[PDB]
Known about the structure:
A: 1 helix, 73% helix, C: 2 strands, binds ligand 3T2
Amino acid sequence: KHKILHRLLQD
Amino acid sequence: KHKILHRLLQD
Amino acid sequence: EDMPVERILEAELAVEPNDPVTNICQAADKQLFTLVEWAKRIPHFSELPLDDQVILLRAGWNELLIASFSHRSIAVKDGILLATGLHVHRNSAHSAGVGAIFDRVLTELVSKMRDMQMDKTELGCLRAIVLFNPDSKGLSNPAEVEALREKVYASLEAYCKHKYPEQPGRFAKLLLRLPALRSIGLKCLEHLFFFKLIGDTPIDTFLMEMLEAP
Amino acid sequence: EDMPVERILEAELAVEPNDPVTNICQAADKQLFTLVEWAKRIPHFSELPLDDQVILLRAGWNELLIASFSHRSIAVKDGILLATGLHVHRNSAHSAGVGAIFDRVLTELVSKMRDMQMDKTELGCLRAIVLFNPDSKGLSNPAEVEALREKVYASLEAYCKHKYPEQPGRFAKLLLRLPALRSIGLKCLEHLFFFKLIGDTPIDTFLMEMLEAP
Ligand SMILES: CC(=C/C=C/C(C)=C/C(=O)O)/C=C1\CCCC(C(C)C)=C1CCC(C)C
Ligand SMILES: CC(=C/C=C/C(C)=C/C(=O)O)/C=C1\CCCC(C(C)C)=C1CCC(C)C
């Protein structure tokens, strides 16, 4: 879940 | 409307 | 200009010496009467036109009552003490379907009130600030209510810093429970409107009147 | 201990240089990306475990975005300026069925922000306080988030009183718009969930993801 959010925070 | 409330505030 | 915390503390001490939902609703109806007497003891509240006094109470009764039984339950473990002298335990609330909101009250309000040892004077002021809500729709003179709210928090901050000089962030910590109170207040109303719709759950006349439009 | 308003103001300046509902939803999806970059620039936000960073943003995105376009619209007469460069006038909002909530934004947020001339530093701090919500359910370490929130308002109060020495009630007046923001934030979500249910109104992937459970 919350795919987009995670990807954005990690980068 | 708001019968009870009015009566209580006036007294 | 003129809004002593002594008068506010006094308003507080003056008003307060099976289905858990039903018992809670009966308690809320009972406290609605006491809430009117409380407000009347808040400086300058009665000097406002009756129409605005009605607007302010109809707009804040729920948060006002939620703050009261929350502070009153700071001693209790996992439950709250109703004004009627009955205790609603966490498990009891959960077994009646209202577990989620009940937990939010314990976690966001009661617990926090207990962790900082919020005193009666502080509670009184916070309720006075909630009472004097300038955003209430329909106010004949919002600026006048806004002015009163500022005098309450001006007095409250002075009280803090003088009573708790070692806690420079107390005043802010107190005001910061308000968004939570607003949130919990809205959720409690939703449940209440739903209880009325469903038909079950007796709702007394004063509480019912609060559910009237607008 | 360490939470300079200079870093916060910078996060603010760094992120921001027909159916009105559709246009608003497109704007919100666009700002959701920018919101992530903003938070990353808030001191100590990135040092928190990714799981909690996700929780904080999922819990405050709506209030965070509402505060931003509200402060951004302080110049506009009766409407708000979207991040996409489009203006939504009060009449336009009313003609699309969202007049009531739109008016609440103008009355409770924009107007008030304009009346006190809330500056960018103040806005930044208020959003930082909203971001650092210790009540967010699921936080691995609520106390740690609570500590950060206190440093933001500690810095904010210092900023006030030093920048606006003649307004001893400014700090409190700023925090007192938070309950309104919370209320308006919850109402905006209800509308959004309803728009999704109804089917009409395109909802982009990031906005849609925010409507996911929990
Ligand atoms: C407006 C409200 C008022 C309370 C008043 C009292 C109980 C006051 C006093 O005893 O001192 C709160 C209500 C009323 C509608 C139903 C519910 C719940 C059952 C949804 C709640 C919230 C009750 C909390 C403890 C979870
Ligand atoms: C969560 C929310 C976010 C906004 C983001 C933006 C527009 C940001 C930017 O442009 O800077 C607010 C929403 C989203 C769901 C629908 C509505 C309304 C149409 C119900 C509102 C509230 C819009 C206000 C102006 C009344």
